[PDB]
C-alpha cells in the first residue's frame, strides 16, 4: 500500500560564502531557520533568506546557542 | 529572578534596534539613582551618559529616584546630546514599563530636543 | 529464539557487511569465542550453539550472549513472481564481522571450556577461535 | 468543504466588492469588516452579501 511521494522542493543554499550577490537575490531556501538572517539580510515568510543590499555573502556562528547567521558586507 | 525576567523582556527590542543600526537611548531604573545612556549603533561605545548618582546633578533635587529625578536626568541627557551633535535616537525601555519614571524621563528628553 | 520486541519497522534494507567488529575483547567472562570469518547468524543458529554449551558445561558457570539478531530477513513464497512489494519477514539474523566475540563464559576450567566452545562452533556457519580474557 | 463563499459590498455607492469565505453554521451573523475601496480611495465599511 506504499508508492506515494512528493515532488522535491529544491531547497538548500543557493549562494555560497564569498560570492557577490545583487539585492533581493535568494541566498538560502529552507523549511525552518537553519540559518538566521544577519546584517543586510531579510527573512521571508517561508524562512527564505534574501539579500537586502549588494555585496559579498558570508556565514558565521554567533549567539549563546552557536546558531548560524548569514550576513552581507558591501564589498 | 527579576534580572532574568527583565533581560528576557528587553532582548527583542535590543535585537531590533541592533539590526536597525541606530543610536539608542538606554535607561536603567532602580529604587534610587535612575541612569541613562546613549549607545552607538555598534553597541561598543557610549556617546554620553547622565544620572543622579554624581554630585554635579544630585545637589539640587531633594531625593533621587522620583519623578523629579527622572525629569532632571531626562533633561540632562538632552543638552548633552544636542551639544554633542546627535539628534535622533531610539528609546529603549530595557524591560521597564513605560509608565512612571521611565515615561517622565522620556517626556523630558523629547521636549528638550531629543525627538523620537 | 532471540528476537526484538515492538521494533520500529517491520522491514529494513539488505545493507552490507563491510567493516570490522567492535566488541573484540572479553568483557564479562574469562573465556570467549571470537569470530574469524564474516557473515550472519540466524536466531536458530544462536539458540543451537547456546544449547550445545549449556549441556556441555552441565549448567555449571555462566553464559553470556554478545550478539542479538535485531535484523529481519524476508523471503518470497515459492512460485511467486518478482515484484509486488517486499517479501514477508521470516527470520532474524545478526551481522558478524571478524573479531566479534560471540559467546562469553566463566566459572569453569580452561580445559572444559575449550571442548564446550568447540562443540558450539561446530554448529555455526563462520570460522571461530578460542580467546581468553586479557589483562587490560 | 462546509465553508462557503460570500461577497463583501462597500457601503459607498461604488460597485466594488471583496470575496471571502465564512461558516454559516457557527457564525451566522453578518460580517462588517472595514476595508479599502479603490474606486473612492477611502476605507469604508463592507457588508456581507451573496
Amino acid at each position: 500500500r506504499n508508492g506515494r511521494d512528493s515532488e522535491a522542493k529544491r531547497l538548500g543554499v543557493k549562494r555560497f560564502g564569498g560570492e557577490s550577490v545583487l539585492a533581493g537575490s535568494i541566498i538560502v531556501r529552507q523549511r525552518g531557520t537553519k540559518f538566521h538572517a544577519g546584517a543586510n539580510v531579510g527573512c521571508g515568510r517561508d524562512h527564505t533568506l534574501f539579500a537586502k543590499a549588494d555585496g559579498k555573502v558570508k556565514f558565521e556562528v554567533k549567539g549563546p546557542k552557536n546558531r548560524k547567521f548569514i550576513s552581507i558586507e558591501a564589498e | 529572578d527579576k534580572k532574568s525576567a527583565r533581560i528576557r523582556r528587553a532582548t527583542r527590542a535590543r535585537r531590533k534596534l541592533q539590526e536597525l543600526g541606530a543610536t539608542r537611548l538606554v535607561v536603567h531604573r532602580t529604587p534610587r539613582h535612575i541612569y541613562a545612556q546613549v549607545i552607538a549603533p555598534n553597541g561598543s561605545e557610549v556617546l554620553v551618559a547622565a544620572s543622579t548618582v554624581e554630585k554635579a546633578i544630585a545637589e539640587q533635587l531633594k531625593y533621587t529616584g522620583n519623578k523629579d529625578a527622572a525629569a532632571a536626568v531626562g533633561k540632562a541627557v538632552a543638552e548633552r546630546a544636542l551639544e554633542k551633535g546627535i539628534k535622533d535616537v531610539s528609546f529603549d525601555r530595557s524591560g521597564f514599563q513605560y509608565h512612571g519614571r521611565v515615561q517622565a524621563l522620556a517626556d523630558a528628553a523629547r521636549e528638550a530636543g531629543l525627538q523620537f | 529464539m532471540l528476537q526484538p520486541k515492538r521494533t520500529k519497522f517491520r522491514k529494513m534494507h539488505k545493507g552490507r557487511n563491510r567493516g570490522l567488529a567492535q566488541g573484540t575483547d572479553v568483557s564479562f567472562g574469562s573465556f570467549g569465542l571470537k569470530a574469524v570469518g564474516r557473515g550472519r547468524l540466524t536466531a536458530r543458529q544462536i539458540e543451537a550453539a547456546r544449547r550445545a554449551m549449556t549441556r556441555a558445561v552441565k549448567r555449571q558457570g555462566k553464559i553470556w550472549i554478545r550478539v542479538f539478531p535485531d535484523k529481519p530477513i524476508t523471503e518470497k513464497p515459492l512460485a511467486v513472481r518478482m515484484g509486488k512489494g517486499k517479501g514477508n519477514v521470516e527470520y532474524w539474523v545478526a551481522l558478524i564481522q571478524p573479531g566479534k566475540v560471540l559467546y562469553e563464559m566463566d566459572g569453569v576450567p580452561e580445559e572444559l571450556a575449550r571442548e564446550a566452545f568447540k562443540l558450539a562452533a561446530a554448529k555455526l556457519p563462520i570460522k571461530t577461535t578460542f580467546v581468553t580474557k586479557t589483562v587490560m | 468543504g462546509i465553508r462557503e463563499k460570500i461577497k463583501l459590498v462597500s457601503s459607498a455607492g461604488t460597485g466594488h466588492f471583496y470575496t471571502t469565505t465564512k461558516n454559516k453554521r457557527t457564525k451566522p451573523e453578518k460580517l462588517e469588516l472595514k476595508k479599502f475601496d479603490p474606486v473612492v480611495r477611502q476605507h469604508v465599511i463592507y457588508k456581507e452579501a451573496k
Partner: protein, 64 residues
Amino acid sequence: PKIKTVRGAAKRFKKTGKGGFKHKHANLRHILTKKATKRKRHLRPKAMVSKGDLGLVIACLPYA
C-alpha cells in the same frame, strides 16, 4: 493553395515589433476567491511567449 491560419491561435497571440508574441495569462478566469491578490495582480498584464514554444506559434499563424 495558400496556407490557412489557425483561427484559434490568432485569437490568443498578437505579434509585436521585434517579432515576439504577447498572450494573456492562463489562470485568471474562475476560482478566484482562494487566490492571493498578489498572484492575480501579476497575472493581469500580458506576457511574452517563451522561446521553446515560439516555433510552434510561428507555424500556427504564418500570415499574422
